[PDB]
Amino acid sequence: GMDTSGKQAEAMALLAEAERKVKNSQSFFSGLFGGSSKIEEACEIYARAANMFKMAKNWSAAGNAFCQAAQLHLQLQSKHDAATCFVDAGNAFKKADPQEAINCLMRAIEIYTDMGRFTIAAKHHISIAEIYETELVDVEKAIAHYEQSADYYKGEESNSSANKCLLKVAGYAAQLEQYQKAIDIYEQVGTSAMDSPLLKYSAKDYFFKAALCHFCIDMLNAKLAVQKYEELFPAFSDSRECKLMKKLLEAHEEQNVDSYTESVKEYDSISRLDQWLTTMLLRIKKT
Amino acid sequence: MAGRSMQAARCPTDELSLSNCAVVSEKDYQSGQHVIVRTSPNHKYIFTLRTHPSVVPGSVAFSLPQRKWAGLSIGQEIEVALYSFDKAKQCIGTMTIEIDFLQK
């Protein structure tokens, strides 16, 4: 419609006017020492142009304008506004081209952590990890970012949020065929959540995962593991997971693949299985 | 003689599993010796040593029946001490065993 062409033309004209203003700013400063009024006004034009490009659905132009404004205002010794503009540019980049958003968010994180504002740095690290996860399958960088964010959250004494980051880290680590970290994280989270009033009802679930992640190593250490949990949390015996584990162990003890498969089918029929659980059960079945 | 720490392991072969002898390395003990294994302050079991070149030093290898009876895990540390039977009170003359097929 008219919006595309009209917004593009008006934004281009305004940006060209801003370019002329910044070009004349040096001459003005040299001839009269006007100060920073010209530079601040040019930054205002750049911000307005970036916003207009954002409304015009042209993400790249908005990101470029945000970067220009951020750089100019950082030259003015204002690190806070520079970080804000860089965050906007990174979002536009994550909304236009993500690779640039990675470095923009890294710079914003550095600026913020320079002052000791750890919560914002942790949130930005989580955002970067999410960016890595969505497009690429480079799990290692996501694990590093999640570990950094969880460490920051733990250092801020903000519990119930680092737990989720550690759960994500353990779940992704269990995918790479490295089970020790997953077992440790799962057991720690389960024992921590056992005592909470609200979280108590979920605790059981965590244990089950560990048991599955404990079954690949060797069957002997899985059986015993179950015992260690049941004595500590007797109510675990009530959940369906214990019965399923016992039936699977009995089926496997005699190479009875068919009984194991039938029990898995029945449990899936009652409640649909997750891709993670499906993959892990398939891996266990290979033996 | 006071006992030494050692790591549990799996039997390198199948034939050795059929003799009820703790499969060990030649660099630690010698075949024919008997040892007492300790895991808890109230569990004291006994095994027959049998050296084999394929056993890594610092570990004993146990068969599936042996591990099941002893409730041992592959990796846990144990305290093994030499045990020399005195041929004056434990020389078997008449013994009885309950025998049943292993595999179902």
Q: Give the CB-side neighbour count of residue A16, counting CA atoms within 13 A.
A: 6
Chain B residues whose CB is inside 8 A of the A218 CB are 74
* DSSP structure class, residue B93: S
Cβ-contact A93, A104 below 8 angstroms: yes
Work out the minimum CA distance from A232 to partner chain B, whole angstroms: 20
Q: What angle do CA A227, A231, A232 make, to 5 degrees?
A: 115
Work out the minimum CA distance from B73 to partner chain A, whole angstroms: 7
Chain A residues whose CB is inside 8 A of the B104 CB are 254
CB contact under 8 A, A254 and B74: no
Task: Tell me the helices (H) and strands (E) count for chain B, helix number first.
Answer: 1, 6
Strand partners for B4: B80
Cβ-contact A121, A113 below 8 angstroms: yes
CB contact under 8 A, B67 and A254: no
Give the number of other Cβ atoms within 10 Å of residue A130's Cβ. Answer: 13
Residue of B nearest to A256 (CA): B104
Residue of B nearest to A255 (CA): B104
Is B74 an interface residue toward A (CB < 8 Å)?
yes
B/e letters for A237-254, b = 16+ CB within 10 Å, e = fewer, are eeeebbebbebbeebbee
Work out the minimum CA distance from B88 to partner chain A, whole angstroms: 39
Experimental method: cryo-EM
**For residues B99 and A231, what is the distance between their CA atoms, to the nearest angstrom?**
33
What burial class does residue B8 get, using C-beta atoms within 10 Å of its C-beta: 0-12 exposed, 13-18 middle, 19+ buried?
buried
Work out the minimum CA distance from B66 to partner chain A, whole angstroms: 13
**For residues B18 and B25, what is the distance between their CA atoms, to the nearest angstrom?**
18
Task: Please state the separation of Cα A237 from the chain's center in Å.
Answer: 35
Q: What angle do CA A179, A185, A187 make, to 5 degrees?
A: 100
Residue of A nearest to B68 (CA): A220
Is B87 an interface residue toward A (CB < 8 Å)?
no
Q: Which two tokens stand for residue B84?
A: 């020399």
Work out the minimum CA distance from A250 to partner chain B, whole angstroms: 13
Residue A160 region by backbone torsions, left for phi larger than 0, else alpha for psi between -120 and 50, else beta: left
Is A255 an interface residue toward B (CB < 8 Å)?
no
Is A224 an interface residue toward B (CB < 8 Å)?
yes
Is B39 an interface residue toward A (CB < 8 Å)?
no
Q: Which residues contact B82 (CB under 8 A, 6 or more apart)?
A: B1, B29, B33, B34, B35, B36
**For residues A245 and A252, what is the distance between their CA atoms, to the nearest angstrom?**
10
Cβ-contact B37, B79 below 8 angstroms: yes
- For A283, the enclosing helix (H) or strand (E) is helix A275-285
Chain A residues whose CB is inside 8 A of the B67 CB are 220
Is B31 an interface residue toward A (CB < 8 Å)?
no
Task: Please state the separation of Cα B21 from the chain's center in Å.
Answer: 5
CB contact under 8 A, B73 and A224: yes
Resolution (A): 3.6
Q: For tokens 């353990």, name the residue.
A: A170
CB contact under 8 A, A254 and B104: yes
Residue B49 region by backbone torsions, left for phi larger than 0, else alpha for psi between -120 and 50, else beta: beta
**For residues A58 and A80, what is the distance between their CA atoms, to the nearest angstrom?**
26
Q: Which two tokens stand for residue A119?
A: 């919560």
Task: Tell me the helices (H) and strands (E) count for chain A, helix number first.
Answer: 14, 0
Return the sign of the alpha-carbon dihedral for residues A205, A211, A213, A216.
negative
Q: Which residues contact B91 (CB under 8 A, 6 or more apart)?
A: none
Specify the long-range contacts of residues B25-28, CB closer than 8 Å, at least 24 apart.
Answer: B25/B51, B25/B52, B25/B53, B25/B55, B25/B56, B25/B57, B25/B59, B26/B51, B26/B52, B26/B53, B26/B55, B27/B57, B28/B57, B28/B58
Is B67 an interface residue toward A (CB < 8 Å)?
yes
Cβ-contact B26, B53 below 8 angstroms: yes
Return the sign of the alpha-carbon dihedral for residues A27, A30, A33, A35.
positive
